[PDB]
Amino acid sequence: RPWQILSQALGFPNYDQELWWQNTAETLNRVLEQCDYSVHLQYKYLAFYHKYILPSLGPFHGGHPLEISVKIDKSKTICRLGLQAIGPLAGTARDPLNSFGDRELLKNLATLLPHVDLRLFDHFNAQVGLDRAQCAVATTKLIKESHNIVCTSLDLKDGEVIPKVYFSTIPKGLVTETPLFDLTFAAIEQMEVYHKDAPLRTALSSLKDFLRPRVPTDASITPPLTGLIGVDCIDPMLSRLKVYLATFRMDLSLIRDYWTLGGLLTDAGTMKGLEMVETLAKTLKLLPFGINYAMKPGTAELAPPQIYFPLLGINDGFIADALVEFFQYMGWEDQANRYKDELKAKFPNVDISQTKNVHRWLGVAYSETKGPSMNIYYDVVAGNV
Amino acid sequence: RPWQILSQALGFPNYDQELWWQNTAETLNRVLEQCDYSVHLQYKYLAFYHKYILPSLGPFHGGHPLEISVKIDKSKTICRLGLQAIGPLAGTARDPLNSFGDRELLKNLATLLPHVDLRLFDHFNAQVGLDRAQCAVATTKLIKESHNIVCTSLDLKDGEVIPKVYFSTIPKGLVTETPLFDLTFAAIEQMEVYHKDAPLRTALSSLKDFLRPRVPTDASITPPLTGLIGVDCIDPMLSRLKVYLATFRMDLSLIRDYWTLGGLLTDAGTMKGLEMVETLAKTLKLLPFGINYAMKPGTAELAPPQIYFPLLGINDGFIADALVEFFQYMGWEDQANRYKDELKAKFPNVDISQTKNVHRWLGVAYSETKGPSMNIYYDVVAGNV
Amino acid sequence: RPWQILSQALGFPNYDQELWWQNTAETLNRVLEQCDYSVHLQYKYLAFYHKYILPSLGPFHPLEISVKIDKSKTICRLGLQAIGPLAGTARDPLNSFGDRELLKNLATLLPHVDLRLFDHFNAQVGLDRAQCAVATTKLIKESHNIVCTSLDLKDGEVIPKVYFSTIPKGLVTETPLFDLTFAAIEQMEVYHKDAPLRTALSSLKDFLRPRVPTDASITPPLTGLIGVDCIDPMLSRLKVYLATFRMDLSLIRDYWTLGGLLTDAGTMKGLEMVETLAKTLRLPFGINYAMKPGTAELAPPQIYFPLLGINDGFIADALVEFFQYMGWEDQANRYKDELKAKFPNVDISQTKNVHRWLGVAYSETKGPSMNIYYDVVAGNV
Amino acid sequence: RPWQILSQALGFPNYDQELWWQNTAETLNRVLEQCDYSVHLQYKYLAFYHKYILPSLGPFHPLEISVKIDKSKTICRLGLQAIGPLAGTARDPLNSFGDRELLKNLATLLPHVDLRLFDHFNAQVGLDRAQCAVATTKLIKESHNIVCTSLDLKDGEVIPKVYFSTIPKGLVTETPLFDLTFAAIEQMEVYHKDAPLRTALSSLKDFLRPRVPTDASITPPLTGLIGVDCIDPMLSRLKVYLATFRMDLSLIRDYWTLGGLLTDAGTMKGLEMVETLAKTLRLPFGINYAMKPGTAELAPPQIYFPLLGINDGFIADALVEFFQYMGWEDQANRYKDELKAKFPNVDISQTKNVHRWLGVAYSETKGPSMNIYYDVVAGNV
Numbered sequence A, B: 001r002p003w004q005i006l007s008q009a010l011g012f013p014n015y016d017q018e019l020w021w022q023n024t025a026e027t028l029n030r031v032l033e034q035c036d037y038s039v040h041l042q043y044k045y046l047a048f049y050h051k052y053i054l055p056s057l058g059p060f061h062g063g064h065p066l067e068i069s070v071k072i073d074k075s076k077t078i079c080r081l082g083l084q085a086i087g088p089l090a091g092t093a094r095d096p097l098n099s100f101g102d103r104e105l106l107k108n109l110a111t112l113l114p115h116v117d118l119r120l121f122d123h124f125n126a127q128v129g130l131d132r133a134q135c136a137v138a139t140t141k142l143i144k145e146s147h148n149i150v151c152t153s154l155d156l157k158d159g160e161v162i163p164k165v166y167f168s169t170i171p172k173g174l175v176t177e178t179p180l181f182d183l184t185f186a187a188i189e190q191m192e193v194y195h196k197d198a199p200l201r202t203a204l205s206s207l208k209d210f211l212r213p214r215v216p217t218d219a220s221i222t223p224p225l226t227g228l229i230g231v232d233c234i235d236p237m238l239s240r241l242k243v244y245l246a247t248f249r250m251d252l253s254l255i256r257d258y259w260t261l262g263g264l265l266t267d268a269g270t271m272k273g274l275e276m277v278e279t280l281a282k283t284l285k286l287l288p289f290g291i292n293y294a295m296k297p298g299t300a301e302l303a304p305p306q307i308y309f310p311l312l313g314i315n316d317g318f319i320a321d322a323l324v325e326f327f328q329y330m331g332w333e334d335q336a337n338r339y340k341d342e343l344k345a346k347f348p349n350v351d352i353s354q355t356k357n358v359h360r361w362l363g364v365a366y367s368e369t370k371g372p373s374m375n376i377y378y379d380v381v382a383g384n385v
Numbered sequence C, D: 001r002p003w004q005i006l007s008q009a010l011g012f013p014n015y016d017q018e019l020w021w022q023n024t025a026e027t028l029n030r031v032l033e034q035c036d037y038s039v040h041l042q043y044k045y046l047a048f049y050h051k052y053i054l055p056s057l058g059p060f061h062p063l064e065i066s067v068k069i070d071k072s073k074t075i076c077r078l079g080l081q082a083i084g085p086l087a088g089t090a091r092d093p094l095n096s097f098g099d100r101e102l103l104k105n106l107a108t109l110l111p112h113v114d115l116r117l118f119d120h121f122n123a124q125v126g127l128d129r130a131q132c133a134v135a136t137t138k139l140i141k142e143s144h145n146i147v148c149t150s151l152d153l154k155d156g157e158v159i160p161k162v163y164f165s166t167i168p169k170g171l172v173t174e175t176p177l178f179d180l181t182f183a184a185i186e187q188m189e190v191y192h193k194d195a196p197l198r199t200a201l202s203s204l205k206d207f208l209r210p211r212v213p214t215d216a217s218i219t220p221p222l223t224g225l226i227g228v229d230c231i232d233p234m235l236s237r238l239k240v241y242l243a244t245f246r247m248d249l250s251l252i253r254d255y256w257t258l259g260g261l262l263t264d265a266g267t268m269k270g271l272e273m274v275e276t277l278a279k280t281l282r283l284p285f286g287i288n289y290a291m292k293p294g295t296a297e298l299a300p301p302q303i304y305f306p307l308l309g310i311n312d313g314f315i316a317d318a319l320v321e322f323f324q325y326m327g328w329e330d331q332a333n334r335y336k337d338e339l340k341a342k343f344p345n346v347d348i349s350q351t352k353n354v355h356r357w358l359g360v361a362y363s364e365t366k367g368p369s370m371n372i373y374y375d376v377v378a379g380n381v
């Protein structure tokens, strides 16, 4: 009902927006129900999605697909939306790298939401953004669906909408012929919060020392590489800063290396998470792999990253069986016994035992305070067509 | 909650729209609850009001106030919205009679709602609408809040939105120096449905014979007069056509004359409704009075009109006591025992025992098939300020 | 140059609008120059086209630019199908909203634009959603349209006109086209108060009754379009258009003279001219009968020759020859060069789709006139 | 005439936009003519102003048109405070969104517009919602603004500039203005990679340290504005503006020469000119120190004389006298007539608010220049 009511109440300004809603909103409503969001929050979020996200999605120019993800720990499941906002001139001479859509979205969110802060967005836009002529050069040197600089996620947590943004470093790297490592840390080392917070500066210096010998010292795009910077759109002093590595090679040895920061982290917390990540890899027998190093102001110590396993081209029925098995290993019997039925109900129009593109990523995390968590990213449109 | 959730989910494009929502939507949500609309329909209608009605309302140019009305019979209470849509150039040289806002609204409704039909709107717009130069002449000859030709109501019935429009005859009357009676019936006699439906033509001819000697034969604006034409925005063949009289004089004798069509209607149905209307007038000891004659294709017989009692300048605490008394007379004990508490809860920010502008109209009706009904029109903004 | 300056000053809200401008506005600017509109009017009309027409055009009948040529002057006109943002979907299957949106915007821009006739014909020949969906089943997939619009760029103003198709209501109601055409006209406010129009129409009916279908069929000749000016109903020309596939010298005489009703020298001079043009030279032929309130007498129609599928180099040579016959030596000596310059990105000697219609007219007061309709996009791609 | 043609072609989406056009566009057209912009550029810039500036202006600092006069030419510039649709409400208390909306639209219109410096300074001196609400308690009710914008109408292009106020972040953070100004500048990408800019800035700091507050107070002279060009950071002039209430011949010397640091004949020729202008002649005085990447040496500032509350007839006579002193006889003989013609709906001899600022500059390569800022609305109402 909510996704249908809102469709009857609001209609659509054009057919593209209708088509996006007809191929996403039922799934979104279902995910929200399954995660135990109340009716009022289902309406909150679907209304929000209708007004603010539909027009950002573009036509039904080369972007990553609209992704709904779930963050699962033993207590609860939190839903999140990941998108490439698309400007109305995206991919044309006037906007070759689609540099305006995501800021338009965030500007609109800043007058909607009382706790959204654009300062980190603006900071990183100044540091890794490009002018028109530089965007045109970057399109010549880039695969035709990487013609993007920023993208956006919306965490649907505690009855609020929490935006996050990701800035790609590659385009400025290609155009300026500057090493990715240098332009990443230079952009970070120029933040206001960096200049006033000793713990962040320590955490970063340790991260730099780990990354220096593993990533390129030259201007090449040779993995592993620092390809993305992530921030929360909140007070700079509260915001997690994230450095993402992209790489094509992952075996048990590189997992250990990335997870522990090459032997720096040796505590039982780290090793229990490591065992869990190694087990997951074995369970899957497994786009680049991602590694996400997270830092916060007021914290001098690096914690283990999150590792993202690409799932495109692996059968979704197998992934679902694999995840049930893995939830059993974790002692999450509740999650194991519903996952498969709940997956079928999110995507009723396809048979998951024949698809290979519905599960896209599986991110893994351990914290000592919070616990272990499972992040599953779905290509929503691929589960509705 | 729904009115608040939608405010958090959607925000506002400008301050005027926020201010309208802050002074209407809580009351609207409360009315909808009191009338037993489910949560899902409360969201349906409030979302609708947010997207479609807020931008039509204009700044927080001379129009009638946004009105929420309730239609009460013993079974149920139906909620309705009445508004003057305001175009963005309303009252300026480019649009002196605000001739565009209501059509903009209806165009938007025609792509939203599957059963909305514009043919009657367009027909009456062709017959009583004016060009720019004629609109400017009419502004010279009109009171500065009658600078309007059409207005709109939205019946919120059976989980649907049913639009109705009202066309004022006075402006074309003033500008063309044509009698109001003539231009009203001429416009009606030119309808497609009139040309093909003998019963409507009979019903109308009886109405004409009753109205001819009571309203002006000349071009004057001397009451009683045919001041408004009302239609439903549905298939012309299903649509009720309504002719409204405005007048300043009402005593028991004119009530009898209007109610029975000067002795034409003499059945017990008509006389029971008459007794009820006479009692209501006595109970109130009572803007013009309105009389609304309703016709439908396939019906050759006129039924008694609805009579509208203006309540502006009478104390709202007295009206509420008066209505409780009157609901008792009718044997509607349920409605009598809640009316006063429910009224206070619709308008918590004012003390109704001191206001005089919250109740605006009280319309009365009797049908033999449906039953007696009570129509109460509230100035929503006056109950929130 | 104006079309380039306005591009630099205004930009585009989206790529479709840019593309329409990049394939139409240079030509439009050139037509305006060739017709001797001043620089200020070139800017007036191109700025107008940018703000009001671009968004009506939809994603990138075809946008038509036409020229009305008599010996004194050449007047430029734009003919379009406005496209609503939900056109062709379940919510708007016959694109019934775009043209009214355009006209509402014009009613606040222009002091003399009147929507009463638009609204009257919309009420009479328009359809509701469910009837629009039935009509889409029974119609070719590019005739999913009810109204279109023209903008006459005359005397430094913009004069709108609208055209209502009768075919959809015909198919849905299974009513003869002749009956619904005249029924819609006979219901006008102006018809009820103007005897001369009623007479003129009764004579047109008497001529059309035995020539068009008495049944519900869509066979030619047929009353397929009603045209009105968006001005005071009492000043507005009402036009009834016939569409037909058969035209020979005998049918020309029949249509031109209303089957022998018109016999004056005015009529016969125009007849000789129209016969010659035919000799000099697949969409139907069009015949357009024009009536005005206060006029009881029918005049000869305008006849539209379809030119789609005929080579544009041949049409140009044919037109030069014909302008010579008329004693318009000036128009004959420039036509070919001016045509090349309107459409520089294409070779007009290779194309078959640039010239679309050639309408012809005679008046005794004004004179003979030539109306050339160009598919602008086909001369630019 | 262009401003009238564009009005007829484009109309207005709402009355506020009409009103702004009816009180600004005639003047803007007249200024452009007087400065010898061709008809095509008059249309370029008025069409631009219609589409992009009107909706930014809000409901009907004040919209300023300025002229930069040297002996060769006069260049026209527009200075505005863009106004967001929720400006001044709880959702946007310091109007922090309008100017970025305007610049985003300019970035797709114009090929050379760059937002990196805009974004950098927005991150450094901008505030979140709760901090914007605190600043509104501590600020006069028309200083509820953080950024404003100018558009230089030079060489047939539009060159945007932005100005960030430091005062709000100052009040909210209780940080000295001097510290936050330089901290924001010292964090630029270009500062970290350009030694000459760092040197130029260090010399400016050394001059400003003992003259402006060391505490958090808002007392003069103070660093109140940072100005940047919206172009490649490496080409962009960075400007630090002082606002002060006290100016005599001694402080002029002090500001002009950087307290004796600059002693060359270029500096002293400009100094004589600025002294004369002062003799010839309540908002503060402005002093604008300009730096560029690749330049290690500070040049003399531009000094802005406030003219609000002084009679405009007297200012005009004062300017004629001063153009004579400069040997600009042409500019002296037309100034007064050209001023009357810019503002025909008002009598400029009765007004005190039309001329707002008079900025003065010397370069050795270019020459002396005169910048006159007009409150356009005050010359039209």
Ligand SMILES: COC(=O)[C@]1(Cc2ccc(O)cc2)OC(=O)C(O)=C1c1ccc(O)cc1
Residues within 6 Å of the ligand: A064, A065, A067, A081, A082, A083, A151, A152, A153, A166, A168, A227, A228, A246, A287, A288, A360, A377
């Ligand atoms: C801009 O980031 C992307 O588009 C991602 C992740 C990514 C990021 C960098 C890179 O070199 C390769 C992949 O590539 C994807 O296919 C994808 O789905 C990504 C992603 C997914 C979810 C999300 O919230 C952000 C990015």
Ligand SMILES: COC(=O)[C@]1(Cc2ccc(O)cc2)OC(=O)C(O)=C1c1ccc(O)cc1
Residues within 6 Å of the ligand: B064, B065, B067, B081, B082, B083, B151, B152, B153, B166, B168, B227, B228, B246, B287, B288, B360, B377
């Ligand atoms: C256009 O109609 C109005 O504005 C009404 C009713 C009316 C109508 C005609 C007239 O000469 C005097 C009053 O005047 C009112 O004050 C008012 O509230 C009217 C009304 C109210 C509700 C509604 O749904 C339609 C009209």
Ligand SMILES: COC(=O)[C@]1(Cc2ccc(O)cc2)OC(=O)C(O)=C1c1ccc(O)cc1
Residues within 6 Å of the ligand: C061, C062, C064, C079, C080, C148, C149, C150, C163, C165, C224, C225, C241, C243, C283, C284, C356
């Ligand atoms: C709805 O009318 C059209 O689309 C026209 C003319 C037409 C009109 C009726 C008909 O039965 C068949 C064709 O068909 C065309 O191909 C075309 O170019 C038409 C036209 C052109 C210009 C104009 O102002 C109106 C219609």
Ligand SMILES: COC(=O)[C@]1(Cc2ccc(O)cc2)OC(=O)C(O)=C1c1ccc(O)cc1
Residues within 6 Å of the ligand: D061, D062, D064, D079, D080, D148, D149, D150, D163, D165, D224, D225, D241, D243, D283, D284, D356
């Ligand atoms: C925020 O800056 C302004 O609004 C200005 C200049 C100013 C700047 C800083 C300050 O502390 C006091 C005044 O104050 C004015 O009255 C005015 O007209 C200013 C101005 C004018 C044009 C321009 O391009 C920028 C600022």
Ligand SMILES: CC(C)=CCC/C(C)=C/CSP(=O)(O)OP(=O)(O)O
Residues within 6 Å of the ligand: A153, A164, A227, A228, A230, A244, A245, A246, A247, A288, A289, A290, A291, A292, A306, A308, A361, A375, A377
């Ligand atoms: C291949 C690379 C480097 C990254 C792509 C992986 C991906 C889906 C990144 C977004 S991670 P995010 O949704 O923001 O998750 P949290 O870090 O807050 O748990």
Ligand SMILES: CC(C)=CCC/C(C)=C/CSP(=O)(O)OP(=O)(O)O
Residues within 6 Å of the ligand: B153, B164, B227, B228, B230, B244, B245, B246, B247, B288, B289, B290, B291, B292, B306, B308, B361, B375, B377
């Ligand atoms: C003074 C005059 C003539 C009329 C004003 C009275 C008024 C409030 C008219 C709208 S009546 P309406 O809401 O459409 O009620 P229904 O007839 O369907 O019951």
Ligand SMILES: CC(C)=CCC/C(C)=C/CSP(=O)(O)OP(=O)(O)O
Residues within 6 Å of the ligand: C077, C150, C161, C224, C225, C227, C239, C241, C242, C243, C244, C284, C285, C286, C287, C288, C302, C304, C357, C359, C371
């Ligand atoms: C009806 C058929 C088959 C073709 C006619 C083509 C057509 C509608 C041309 C426009 S006629 P129009 O431009 O409105 O010209 P005028 O009658 O005012 O001279």
Ligand SMILES: CC(C)=CCC/C(C)=C/CSP(=O)(O)OP(=O)(O)O
Residues within 6 Å of the ligand: D077, D150, D161, D224, D225, D227, D239, D241, D242, D243, D244, D284, D285, D286, D287, D288, D302, D304, D357, D359, D371
């Ligand atoms: C800072 C004070 C008090 C007044 C200055 C008034 C002001 C900001 C004028 C604009 S300076 P601007 O137009 O940007 O001119 P240029 O420096 O490029 O010559």
